[PDB]
Paper text:
However, amongst these remodelers, the INO80 chromatin remodeler appears largely sufficient to generate the well positioned +1 and −1 nucleosomes. S.c INO80 is a multi-subunit complex consisting of 15 subunits that are divided into three different modules. The catalytic module with the Ino80 (ATPase) RecA lobes and insert, Arp5, Ies6, Ies2, Rvb1 and Rvb2, constitutes the core unit of INO80 (C-module).
With S.c 0/80 nucleosomes, we see larger differences between the structures in the apo and ADP/BeFx states. In both states, the C-module of INO80 bound to S.c nucleosomes adopts a similar architecture seen with X.l 0/80 nucleosomes. These data suggest that on S.c 0/80 nucleosomes as compared to X.l 0/80 nucleosomes, a greater proportion of INO80 adopts a state where the Arp8 module is more dynamic. However, the conformational heterogeneity of the Arp8 module on S.c 0/80 nucleosomes, which are remodeled ~45-fold faster than X.l 0/80 nucleosomes provides an additional snapshot into INO80’s sliding mechanism.
Numbering used by the authors:
A (entry chain H): 36 to 128
B (entry chain S): 112 to 162
C (entry chain F), H (entry chain B): 24 to 102
D (entry chain E), I (entry chain A): 40 to 134
E (entry chain G): 15 to 118
F (entry chain R): 436 to 506, 532 to 570, 584 to 588
G (entry chain C): 66 to 119
The structure:
DNA sequence: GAGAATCCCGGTGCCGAGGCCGCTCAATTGGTCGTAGACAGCTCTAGCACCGCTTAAACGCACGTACGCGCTGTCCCCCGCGTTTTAACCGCCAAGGGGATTACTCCCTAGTCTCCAGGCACGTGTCAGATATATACATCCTGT
DNA sequence: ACAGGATGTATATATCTGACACGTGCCTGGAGACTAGGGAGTAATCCCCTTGGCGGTTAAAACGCGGGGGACAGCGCGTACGTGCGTTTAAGCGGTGCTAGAGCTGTCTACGACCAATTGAGCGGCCTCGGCACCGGGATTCTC
C-alpha cells in the first residue's frame, strides 16, 4: 500500500480545468512539493512548540509557522482560508 | 439586527470575503480593509464579539 | 533625520572594515536601503516570535533564534 | 605635504587589529525603535537584543563589503560603485 | 459515519495528515485544529499551483501538464519563485532571458 | 557652445512670445501640461494594472513569454522590450514629473478632501 | 586551538578575538562553522596586493 | 580518458543554454574540475548513505537526500 | 549567408527553447563509477540515480553560467575568462 | 632628514575569574516485560556484460574578425585636514510594567476496541498519430 | 530559355499501432464511542529590569576646500576564439542471459522504556585577588 496524494490533486485540478491531464513526472512534482511543504511547516511548528515549554501542538503554532514560512500575500490568504476551514469544522452543530 | 461598518460606524453595505469586515464604500475598503496588518481585524471584530 | 541616525563616519568605518580604500561619494542611499531591509526582515521575525510568546518586549533570545532561522546564527547571546 | 592613500592603509591597519564596536548605541537604537513601530505599537526592548542587532548588522556589512571590494578589483578598479553593489547582491543571491 | 474532510469542507484528507503528524515525533501532544489547518493550507497551495500550471499548459496550446509548464508557472510568478528559490526542478528547462547589450 | 547658443536663442524667442502673446502661450503651456498629466495618469494606470496577477495584462505578458518559450530583428526587439522595468518605470515617472513641473513653470511664466 | 591562539598573543586569558583567529586560521573549523558569526572578535587581517602600493 | 570523457561541445551546449555568447579555450578543464568536485561532494554523502543502508546498490533515495542536505533539493525523483 | 553573431543568437535561442539533456550518458556513467570506486569498490548504481546526477549537474552548470556571464558583463566584456569563474565561485561562497 | 605615529615598558587602579559552600533535584541503581531488532530464509526485480551497427557528434583544422588587453589623456571626485556643531556617553535615581513563579480546576487529548470504505494494484478501451492509395493539377529543377 | 519528367499538394478515403485514458477487487487505516490522567488555562503575586530624564562632558560628526591619484572614454596591436568544413569514434540501441541483492516474512530474543528508591553532582550565591584595562614617558619606525 504505497501511499501518495494522486487522487486529491486530481480532483482539485478537475474542478477548474476539466479537459486537462497530468504527466507522471509532473505527478511526482506535485507529490514531492506537498511533502516538502508538510515537512517544513511541521518542523517549524514543532520548533515553535519547543520554544515555549509547551508539549502540545495546536492551531495557533501552525498559524504562526504559516506566517513565518510563506511570503506575505500567500500568508494572508492561507491564514484566511485556514481560519474559514477551522470555523467550519468547529461549528459542527 | 442592524449591520454597521466596522471602521467608520456608518451603515455597512458590503462585507469583505477575506477577513469578514463590513465596510461602507470603496475608499474605506481600498485604504483600510485591503492593506491592513494581519492581526488587526480580530479586535475590529472583538467590539461586536465576532472573533 | 529619521534614517540619518547612521552617518558618514559610521559607514566609512564599516567600508574600511571591509578593507576597501576608495569609496564613492554617493554610495550612501543603497547602503541605507539594504540596512533598512535587513533590519525590517530581522525584527519582523523577532516580532512574530515574541507575539506568539505573549511577550510584548523584544528579547535577545528571539532575535538570535530569528537569525538562526535566517541562517546567520550568532554565538554568545544565548542559544 | 602629504600623499593620499598611505594614511588610508595606515588606519586600515589601525582599525584592523582592534575589534571594537563601530556605530554608536543611541542613533541605531532609535532607528531600531522606529523600524519596529509599524508592526506593533508600544513595544519595549532590552539592551542585549540591541547589541545582537548591532553585531548582526556589522557582520552583514563587512561580509558584503570585502566581497564588493573583490568585485571592484576584478573589473580592474579601486573605487566602488552602484553596479558593484548590485553585482555582489546578485552573486550572493538575495534576488 | 462521514469523514472530517467533508465536515470542514475540504478534499484533502484530515485523518491521514493527523496520522502523519502523530508518529512523525514532532511533539507528544497534538490538538484537533492542527490537521484541519494544515489541510486547508495544503489545499490553497496545491490549488494555486494547479491554476498557474493549467494556465501555462493552455498557453502552450497543448492538452496535458508537462513539467515545462510547471517551470513556467513557478518562475513567472513572483512569490512562488520566492518560496521555491531553492528547489531544482526535474525536466523543466530555463526561462528565456537575454541581456540587453548582446542584442546588437 | 552651439547647443548652448541654440538654447539661449530658444529662451529669447520664448520670452519674446510670452511678452508678445501671454494668453496664447499660457493656453499652449496649459494644454501641454494637461497632455503631460494625461500621459502620467496613463502610465500610472499601466503600472497599477501590471501589478495585478489576475489582470488581463499579466495574462497577455504570460502569453508573450510562453510565445517566446513554446514555438529576426523585430522579434529580437520584442524580446528586448518584454523585460522587467521596475526601476526604469520609476525613472521615467520622475522624468515625466520633471516635464510636468517644467510645463507648470511655463504656464506660470506666460484629490479634494471634501469628497 | 584557543590555548595556542592565546600563547602567541602574550595573554594568559582567552579572549573571543583569539579564538576568532583560531577558527579563522584552521580550515576544518573554518568551513565547519562558516555560516556562524561570533562576538566582538572582528575579522582576521589580510591585505590584497594591488591595494598595497609601490 | 574518463575525466574529459564528457566533451567540449557538450560544455558549449550547456553554456549556450546558460546564455553566454563567447567562451574561452581555457575554461573547459576548470569546468571539468568544478564538475568533478561537485560529484565528489555528492557521492561521498550518497556512499555513506548506502553504506549505512546495508546495501551495495545506490538507489535514488540516497542521492536525493545527498542533494537535499546541501541546499539543492530536487523534485520528481523522490517518489 | 549570415553575419557572425546572428546564427549564434539563433542557436542560443534554440538551446534555451528546448528541454533535452546535453550530456552524453555513457561517459557520465563511466565517470560516476570511476569516481565512486575509490570511496567504495564493486558498487551498484540505479539508472534514475544517474538521471538525478545528470539533472543536478545540468542545473548547477547552467546557474554557474548565469553568474559567470554576469561577471563577464560586469568587467565590460563578452567572453568569459577563468577569473570570472573564480570570482563567481568566491562570491557564491564556496572555495 | 623632519614628523608623526605606532610599539614598548613601567606603574596603577579595578572588577570579573576562580575558588568555596548550602542543598536540591536529578543521576544511578534495580527489577519487569512488551516488543523492536537481529537474523535466517526466500521470491524475483532489476542491474551488470556485451555483440554489433548507424551515425550524430566529437575531433581536427583553416580563416579571420570581434574582441581582450595595453596605452593614454582628461575631467573630476573623493582624500586629508582644520574648524565648528552637535549629540553620544555617562552617572544615576526612580516608577512600575510585566515576566517568573505559584496555586489549582478542568477541558483536552492519548489509549483501546470495533470496523468499513476509501484508496491502491492491476485489469480493460480510446482517439492521436503514422502510414498508405489514387487522380489529377501544380510546380520545380535540370538539360537540351 | 523552355519542356519534360521528377516530386508536391490536395482532399478525400483506407488500415493499423501508440500512448494515454477508465474500471474493478480488496485490505488496512480512518471513524466512532469511551475513559481518565494531566498538560494547559488562569488568577495572584514577587520583584528584575526597563524606561525617562535631569545635565555635563568632549570626542565624534559636518562643512568646507585644495588637489592629485584614479575612473573612464578613446585608441590600436594582435591573438585568441568564432565559423565553417572534412575526418573520425565511440555515443546510442536493443537484444538478452546471469544473477546480485533488494525486498519481504516468520521466529527468536535481547535491548530499552518504566517505576521506585535515593544521594551527591552541580547550580545559586558569596568573597579574595590578580590580569588585563588604563595611563603616561619615550623608543622607534614608516613616510614624503
Amino acid at each position: 500500500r504505497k501511499e501518495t496524494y494522486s487522487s486529491y490533486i486530481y480532483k482539485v485540478l478537475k474542478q477548474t480545468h476539466p479537459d486537462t491531464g497530468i504527466s507522471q513526472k509532473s505527478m511526482s512534482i506535485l507529490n514531492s512539493f506537498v511533502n516538502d511543504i508538510f515537512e517544513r511547516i511541521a518542523t517549524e511548528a514543532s520548533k515553535l512548540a519547543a520554544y515555549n515549554k509547551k508539549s502540545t501542538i495546536s492551531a495557533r503554532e501552525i498559524q504562526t509557522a504559516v506566517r513565518l514560512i510563506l511570503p506575505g500575500e500567500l500568508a494572508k490568504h492561507a491564514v484566511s482560508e485556514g481560519t474559514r476551514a477551522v470555523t467550519k469544522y468547529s461549528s459542527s452543530t | 439586527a442592524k449591520k454597521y461598518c466596522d471602521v467608520t460606524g456608518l451603515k455597512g453595505f458590503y462585507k469583505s470575503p477575506t477577513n469578514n469586515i463590513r465596510y461602507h464604500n470603496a475608499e474605506i475598503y481600498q485604504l483600510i480593509v485591503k492593506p491592513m496588518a494581519p492581526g488587526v481585524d480580530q479586535e475590529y471584530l472583538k467590539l461586536r464579539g465576532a472573533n | 533625520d529619521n534614517i540619518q541616525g547612521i552617518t558618514k563616519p559610521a559607514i566609512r568605518r564599516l567600508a574600511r572594515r571591509g578593507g576597501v580604500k576608495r569609496i564613492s561619494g554617493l554610495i550612501y542611499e543603497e547602503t541605507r536601503g539594504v540596512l533598512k531591509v535587513f533590519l525590517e526582515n530581522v525584527i519582523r521575525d523577532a516580532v512574530t516570535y515574541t507575539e506568539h510568546a505573549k511577550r510584548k518586549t523584544v528579547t535577545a533570545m528571539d532575535v538570535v533564534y530569528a537569525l538562526k532561522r535566517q541562517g546567520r546564527t550568532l554565538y554568545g547571546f544565548g542559544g | 605635504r602629504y600623499k593620499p592613500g598611505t594614511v588610508a592603509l595606515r588606519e586600515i591597519r589601525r582599525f584592523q587589529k582592534s575589534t571594537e564596536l563601530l556605530i554608536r548605541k543611541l542613533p541605531f537604537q532609535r532607528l531600531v525603535r522606529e523600524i519596529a513601530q509599524d508592526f506593533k505599537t508600544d513595544l519595549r526592548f532590552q539592551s542585549s537584543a540591541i547589541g545582537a542587532l548591532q553585531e548582526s548588522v556589522e557582520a552583514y556589512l563587512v561580509s558584503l563589503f570585502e566581497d564588493t571590494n573583490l568585485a571592484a578589483i576584478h573589473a580592474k578598479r579601486v573605487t566602488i560603485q552602484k553596479k558593484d553593489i548590485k553585482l555582489a547582491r546578485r552573486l550572493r543571491g538575495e534576488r | 459515519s462521514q469523514s472530517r474532510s467533508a465536515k470542514a469542507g475540504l478534499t484533502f484528507p484530515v485523518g491521514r495528515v493527523h496520522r502523519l503528524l502523530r508518529r512523525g515525533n514532532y511533539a507528544q501532544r497534538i490538538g484537533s485544529g492542527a490537521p484541519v489547518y494544515l489541510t486547508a493550507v495544503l489545499e490553497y497551495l496545491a490549488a494555486e499551483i494547479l491554476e498557474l500550471a493549467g494556465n501555462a499548459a493552455r498557453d502552450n496550446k497543448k492538452t496535458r501538464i508537462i513539467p515545462r509548464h510547471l517551470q513556467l508557472a513557478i518562475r513567472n510568478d513572483d512569490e512562488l519563485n520566492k518560496l521555491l528559490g531553492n528547489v531544482t526542478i526535474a525536466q523543466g528547462g530555463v526561462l528565456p532571458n537575454i541581456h540587453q547589450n548582446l542584442l546588437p | 557652445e552651439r547647443v548652448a547658443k541654440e538654447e539661449e536663442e530658444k529662451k529669447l524667442k520664448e520670452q519674446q512670445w510670452r511678452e508678445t502673446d501671454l494668453n496664447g502661450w499660457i493656453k499652449d503651456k496649459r494644454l501641454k501640461l494637461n497632455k503631460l498629466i494625461k500621459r502620467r495618469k496613463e502610465k500610472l494606470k499601466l503600472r497599477d494594472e501590471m501589478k495585478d496577477r489576475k489582470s488581463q495584462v499579466s495574462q497577455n505578458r504570460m502569453k508573450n513569454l510562453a510565445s517566446l518559450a513554446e514555438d529576426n530583428d523585430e522579434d529580437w526587439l520584442i524580446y528586448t522590450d518584454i523585460t522587467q522595468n521596475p526601476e526604469a518605470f520609476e525613472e521615467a515617472l520622475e522624468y515625466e514629473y520633471k516635464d510636468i513641473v517644467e510645463l507648470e513653470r511655463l504656464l506660470l511664466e506666460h484629490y479634494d478632501w471634501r469628497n | 586551538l584557543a590555548g595556542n591562539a592565546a600563547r602567541d598573543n602574550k595573554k594568559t586569558r582567552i579572549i573571543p578575538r583569539h579564538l576568532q583567529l583560531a577558527i579563522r586560521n584552521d580550515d576544518e573549523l573554518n568551513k565547519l562553522l562558516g555560516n556562524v558569526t561570533i562576538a566582538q572578535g572582528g575579522v582576521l587581517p589580510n591585505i590584497h596586493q594591488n591595494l598595497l602600493p609601490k
